Amino acid sequence: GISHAEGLCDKEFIGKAISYLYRYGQIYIGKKIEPYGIGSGQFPFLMRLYREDGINQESLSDYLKIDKGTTARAIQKLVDEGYVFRQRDERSYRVFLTEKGKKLEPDMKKIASEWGEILFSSFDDRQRREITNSLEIMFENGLKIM
Amino acid sequence: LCDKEFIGKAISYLYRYGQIYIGKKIEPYGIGSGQFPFLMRLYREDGINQESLSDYLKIDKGTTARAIQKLVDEGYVFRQRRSYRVFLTEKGKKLEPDMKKIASEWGEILFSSFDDRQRREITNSLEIMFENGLKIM
């Protein structure tokens, strides 16, 4: 309290805060997506396909930095739920949204919003903006040395 | 891409990048990145009921059981009696300075390009966000 006003900081706090927000996020998102029969482990893949559809399953793995075996199980449940399909292309597989998956998008993006909204409570626009900006740089700082 | 939507994604990517990073730094101790958070909480509070670890970290029971079981196999924790309290072994206790250095090294990397004032605003903001999300649990 005097330590923080004096400038000193828990150099562990950044990583701790992030791990917790992530886990809280997975719980909050998790409950909201259950009704679509989707686990919070599948959400990140679905959200990626909405940006870049028809991506190779290995690419999905490397970008999200989720392992091949976790990736395989996630994509498999997404297929069994009928939200995506796989296509072998002239070995490995490319994954695509089905119509069912495409029509889900407004719901997914809205769920992600309600979560951000919960996180930003008490922040105004300038403040939301520069924290999102700082989170972008923090990530590129990791990404450099990854 | 909306700010509200993207803050989730940014946090998720930082998390996963953190685990891969921590994961590599702690590999010489035979520790997985999944057990790391349990070890850290024990540094704050030794001899806690296992479900209390689970509740606090908000990692579910199976994930917790497997992680604890590995830390026991690895010799870093033991259990005493279901209701088990988990304690650090001496070998677990010795690792603490290294674990804290490694976590703080990840922090430094994330903040590497910021001036002092950006670091303070960021931290302050994270605390607020942290509490906002804690209330919703």
Q: Do A116 and B20 count as a contact with CB atoms less than 8 A apart?
A: no
User: Any chain A CB within 8 A of the CB of B11?
Assistant: yes
User: Min CA distance, A79 vs chain B (Å)?
Assistant: 23
Residue B53 structural domain: 1-136
What does the alpha-carbon distance between residue A21 and residue B132 come to, in Å, rounded to a whole number? 9
Residues 6+ apart with CB under 8 A from A113: B2, B4, B5
User: Any chain B CB within 8 A of the CB of A116?
Assistant: yes
Q: Are A13 and B130 in contact (CB under 8 A)?
A: no
Stated resolution in angstroms: 2.5
What does the alpha-carbon distance between residue B123 and residue B125 come to, in Å, rounded to a whole number? 5
User: Min CA distance, B79 vs chain A (Å)?
Assistant: 25
Residues 6+ apart with CB under 8 A from A21: A119, B11, B126, B129, B130, B133
Q: Do B10 and A135 count as a contact with CB atoms less than 8 A apart?
A: yes
Question: How many CB atoms lie under 10 A from the CB of residue B28?
Answer: 8
Way it was determined: X-ray
The label of the residue with tokens 């979560």 reads A115
A29, exposed or middle or buried, with CB in 10 Å at 0-12, 13-18, 19+? Answer: buried
Phi, psi values for residue A48, rounded to 5°: -70, -45
Q: Are B50 and B85 in contact (CB under 8 A)?
A: yes
Q: Indicate the number of domains in chain A.
A: 1
Find which of A16, A133, A138 to mutate to test the B interface (most B CBs within 10 Å of its CB).
A138
The enclosing domain of A10 has a CATH number of 1.10.10.10
Structure tokens at B5: 């939507």
Residue B46 DSSP one-character state? S
H-run or E-run covering A85: strand A84-88
Hey, what's the torsion of the CAs at A40, A46, A51, A57, to 10 degrees? Answer: 110
What does the alpha-carbon distance between residue B77 and residue B86 come to, in Å, rounded to a whole number? 7
